[PDB]
């Protein structure tokens, strides 16, 4: 099987950078393919027989390489390319196809939107209780978040959530939820969620206080 | 339009079998290859195997042969695709393609598993501009649709935990609004569960 391994495996770069991304197939090749997937679609052809563009790519795109060494290039990074890119041999079988290289793009450092939830009536008279915790419009998505129960970190129970880059300002939300028993929850009165962030000197503290805040 | 339309999510036993479908149309069923590719975990795409329709012509996978089956029905321009002894190592999503890999389907996402379908309970997440929230926790089958009444909504990936998935989103609206207006929270699914909120 001709391995075909893509370097960088991720990488963000800012709108206008030029970026290049290669393919090395394990054995030689006559052609190479590419390939563009966006979070929740289907892979796209973006350039294929190694030169050629497929309809619709932009003529920023341009593909070169041979025999065993392949790559991509962007003269301009732009929003809507932000992507994985996927390189495929078809010159023989199996067919192969390379790990991805995933492209993000940089941004202006920015620090989360906290807001902390208690919880509902419903879920309280159901026997749990979960304290969610949202982390909105955040770059870079390297962020730590820790739950403080009176004063007390929990580890287990805490359930972290990412989302993909956000298409229009281009930065990371999370969303964290501690989950507790009915019973763990009254007896214990103040929930703080701190974030640890790249902006923060320090930490971005949300509380609330069980009674009355 | 040339659409290959593929069918949809499917949860099975480890030891079933599944068939997957790809009705394609728009285009000239017999004159391309029908191939179909394997989409795991993350990044990972393998080319399962590929059909020549009406001539019915394989061409496998060395690793996909045994558990493959690709068949095509000329007629109803349908390629298919059976998988059996399926286990959770064969959770993942599958395209058929066409035209050279130009064309590509929509996905089937399969999990196989044993663990129970579940419906989800949603909860309203009010505060103590105007942020807001619902959490849908504990449903097995991962697709589940979240909306809000119809921008600043915010939905997260799921997590899943003991066999149970967990999803929340967060809108952000401005205080003039809510609570004047309301804010609804639509969950479907998992369950055949169809949920509104507050």
């Known amino acids: 099987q001709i391995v075909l391994t893509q370097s960088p495996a991720i990488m963000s770069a800012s709108p206008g950078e030029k970026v290049t991304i290669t393919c090395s197939a394990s054995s030689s090749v006559s052609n190479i393919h590419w390939f563009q997937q966006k979070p929740g679609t289907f892979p796209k052809l973006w350039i294929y027989?190694?030169?050629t563009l497929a309809s619709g790519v932009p003529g920023r795109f341009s593909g070169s390489g041979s025999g065993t060494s392949y790559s991509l290039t962007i003269s301009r990074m732009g929003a809507e390319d932000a992507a994985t890119y996927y390189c495929?041999?078809?010159?023989?079988?199996?067919?192969?196809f390379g790990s991805g290289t995933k492209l993000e793009i940089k941004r202006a450092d920015a620090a989360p939107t906290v807001s902390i939830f208690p919880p509902s009536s419903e879920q309280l008279t159901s026997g749990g209780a979960s304290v969610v915790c949202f982390l909105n419009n955040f770059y870079p998505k390297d962020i730590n978040v820790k739950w403080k129960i009176d004063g007390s970190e929990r580890q287990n129970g805490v359930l972290n959530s990412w989302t993909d880059q956000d298409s229009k300002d281009s930065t990371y939300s999370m969303s964290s939820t501690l989950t507790l028993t009915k019973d763990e929850y009254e007896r214990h009165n103040s929930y703080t969620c701190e974030a640890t962030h790249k902006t923060s000197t320090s930490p971005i503290v949300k509380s609330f206080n069980r009674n009355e805040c | 339009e040339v659409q290959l339309q593929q069918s949809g999510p499917e949860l099975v036993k480890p030891g079933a079998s599944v068939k997957i479908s790809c009705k394609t149309s728009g285009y000239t069923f017999t004159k391309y290859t029908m191939h179909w590719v394997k989409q795991s975990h993350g990044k990972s795409l393998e080319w399962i195997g590929d059909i020549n329709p009406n001539n019915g012509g394989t061409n496998y996978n060395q690793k996909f042969k045994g558990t493959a089956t690709l068949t095509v029905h000329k007629s109803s321009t349908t390629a298919y695709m059976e998988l059996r002894s399926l286990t959770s190592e064969d959770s993942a999503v599958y395209y058929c393609?066409?035209?050279?890999?130009?064309?590509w389907g929509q996905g089937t996402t399969l999990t196989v598993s044993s663990a129970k379908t579940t419906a989800p309970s949603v909860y309203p997440l009010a505060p103590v501009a105007v942020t807001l929230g619902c959490l849908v926790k504990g449903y097995f089958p991962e697709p589940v649709t979240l909306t809000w009444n119809s921008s600043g909504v915010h939905t997260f990936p799921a997590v899943l935990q003991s066999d149970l998935y967990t999803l929340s989103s967060s809108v952000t609206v401005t205080s003039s609004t809510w609570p004047s207006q309301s804010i609804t929270c639509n969950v479907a699914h998992p369950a055949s569960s169809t949920k509104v909120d507050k």
């Open positions: 495929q041999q078809r010159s023989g079988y199996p067919f192969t």
């Open positions: 027989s190694t030169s």
């Open positions: 393609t066409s035209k050279s890999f130009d064309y």
